[PDB]
Structures are given as structure tokens and as C-alpha cells.
Design a protein around this ligand. Structure first.
Ligand SMILES: CCS(=O)(=O)Nc1cc(-c2cc(NC3CCNCC3)c(=O)n(C)c2)cc2c1ccn2C(C)(c1ccccn1)c1ccccn1
Ligand code: NA
Length: 127
């Protein structure tokens, strides 16, 4: 099995805006998770070909990763903050579905998700 193409990250047919909350999601939330010790398996799509994990995209039909989220934020792909928060949540739940509770990758994702939730509780005031 091939890898799937990565999720779309640019679309000029989508209106674009800058907002307080989107700027925070890139400059604070994504930046804080990205520089964490455990970010690295989540910084790009799961490369099922390289990892010899041919079952990965047989089960995970909404893949998501922080590389994709970073590029979506940089390309103004999201209009609403919740569209970006949904993508972080998808990344975490994908990990929790594929991998057994307590597995190394799950403990890494849980350490990132704790920090994510703290930063989402500090989202700035909407326009
Ligand atoms: C940047 C994305 S990538 O190119 O796809 N690279 C990598 C991604 C991932 C990874 C693996 C997952 N699932 C597997 C399922 C089988 N058991 C292990 C976890 C997963 O859900 N996510 C989100 C990311 C692990 C990686 C590497 C590279 C090395 N590892 C290993 C060493 C790994 C394993 C566990 C925890 C952390 N790292 C690895 C070990 C065994 C098999 C595959 N990868
Ligand atoms: Na739109």
C-alpha cells in the first residue's frame, strides 16, 4: 500500500482572515507543542510505508498531524478557531484508537494533550 497524500493545507477558494484566536493557536499553542520533547512523531503525517505499518490507513480515515496543522494556520486555511482545535483533537483521538492504552506513543500524546488543554483554557478574547 502507498501512503495517502497528506491532508490539504492550502485552498484559495476558501475566504481568509486573521483573528486573535487563530494567531494564538499558531504563536502559542502550536509553538508550545512543536518544541516539546515528544512532538517529533506528530510533526508530519504517519509514514506508513517507511514504518512498515500497512494497516494504519486501513483504520485511520481522518489522519491529522501538527505539520499539517502548522501549514493550515500559515496558509489561513481555518476561518474559525474551533476548526483548528478539532484537528488537534483528531490527531490525539487517532493515536488513542490505533494504539493500546499505556503504549509509549499514547503516553507521548497524553503529555502533549495536557499542555494543549492548558493553552486552550487561555484562548484570548474573540472579536
Ligand atoms: C514523523 C512521522 S513518521 O515519519 O511516521 N515517524 C514516526 C511516527 C511514529 C508514530 C507511530 C504510531 N503508531 C505506532 C503503531 C505501532 N507501535 C508503535 C506506534 C502513531 O500512532 N503515531 C502518531 C506516530 C513512530 C515512529 C516514527 C519513527 C520512529 N517511530 C518509532 C520509533 C516510535 C514508536 C513509538 C513511539 C515513538 N516512536 C516506531 C516504533 C515502532 C514502530 C514504528 N515506529
Ligand atoms: Na469556507
Amino acid at each position: 500500500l502507498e501512503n495517502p497524500p497528506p491532508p490539504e493545507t492550502s485552498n484559495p477558494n476558501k475566504p481568509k482572515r486573521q483573528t486573535n484566536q487563530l494567531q494564538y493557536l499558531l504563536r502559542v499553542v502550536l509553538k508550545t507543542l512543536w518544541k516539546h520533547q515528544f512532538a517529533w512523531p506528530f510533526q508530519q503525517p504517519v509514514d506508513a510505508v517507511k514504518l512498515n505499518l500497512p494497516d494504519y490507513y486501513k483504520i485511520i480515515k481522518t489522519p491529522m498531524d501538527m505539520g499539517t496543522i502548522k501549514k493550515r494556520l500559515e496558509n489561513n486555511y481555518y476561518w474559525n478557531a474551533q476548526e483548528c482545535i478539532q484537528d488537534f483533537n483528531t490527531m490525539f483521538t487517532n493515536c488513542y484508537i490505533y494504539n493500546k492504552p499505556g503504549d509509549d506513543i499514547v503516553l507521548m500524546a497524553e503529555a502533549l494533550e495536557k499542555l494543549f488543554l492548558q493553552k486552550i483554557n487561555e484562548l484570548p478574547t474573540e472579536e
